[PDB]
Design brief:
Two copies of one chain form a homodimer. With 133 residues, chain A is α/β, with parallel strands linked by helices. Chain A has a single domain, classed as 3-Layer(aba) Sandwich (Rossmann fold), CATH 3.40.50. Helices cover 35% and strands 20% of the residues of chain A. Chain A has six helices and five strands; from the N terminus they run E-H-E-H-H-E-H-E-H-E-H. A five-stranded parallel beta sheet of chain A has the order 3-2-1-4-5. In chain A, strand 4, helix 5 and strand 5 form a beta-alpha-beta unit. The longest helix of chain A is centred in the N-terminal third of the chain and has 11 residues. The radius of gyration of chain A is 16 Å and the shape is globular. Chains A and B meet through helix 1, helix 3 and helix 6 of A and helix 1, helix 3 and helix 6 of B. Chains A, B: Belongs to the cytidylyltransferase family.
């Protein structure tokens, strides 16, 4: 009955969008365990992009999030069939391709992005109080 | 046995510092109910200071925080003896004076600020990547 759900990501400057994704992943089924993977400083900066907080910082913050049941930190850069097996993962939850194989395997669950709620969006709102001229 | 704890604040651009305060308030006793009061856009801007997010935004985010059991939104600008009675509050948790009377009443519990972990501190870290010259 309990369904094990896995979501990975950077979770840099955690905001409501991350939280709503995590909420969504948690509530995919009646009874779940949500496992969250936190990608490393190094594999992120290299393959993905710039990151403000250290792995330890990003990892610490996620402990405060209601929906998060387990944290893997650092997580493998790439999910594999072996990892899903090792960690008993029924579904990987992510937004809508390194996920195509999870879809083909029937082990993918889409969650939805939330727009305009990021940490940087809030700073932009602060800056908009100052007119160009 | 269950101890009812009350913490109020703006909770603008919620960050790890808020979270650690909330954690601390939650864990003051073995069994607690943590009630969190979210101060209004209007009474904050007036009596306190500038605020980025609306009451609804600040309130929504707190729902994602593990430690938070109940939310009062908007909360009364000022705690009163009557409010503590109405909401069965045993202790108000806050950092270390509109709290002196709670101390005198033996209904105050200090929590600790966390420095350097605020939303704005993270933006400052971003900006430091750009040299003045």
């Amino acid at each position: 009955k309990n369904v094990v759900i896995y979501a990975d990501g950077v979770y840099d400057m955690l905001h409501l969008g991350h939280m709503k994704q995590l909420e969504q992943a948690k509530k995919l089924f009646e009874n779940t365990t949500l496992i969250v993977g936190v990608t490393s400083d190094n594999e992120t900066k290299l393959f993905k992009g710039q990151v403000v907080q250290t792995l330890e910082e990003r990892t610490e913050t996620l402990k405060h999030i209601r929906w998060v049941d387990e944290i893997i930190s650092p997580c493998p850069w790439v999910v594999t069939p072996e990892f899903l097996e090792k960690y008993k993962i029924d579904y990987v939850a992510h937004d809508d391709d390194i996920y195509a194989w999870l879809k083909r395997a029937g082990k993918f669950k889409a969650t939805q992005r939330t727009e305009g709620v990021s940490t940087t969006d809030l700073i932009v709102r602060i800056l908009k109080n100052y007119e160009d001229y």
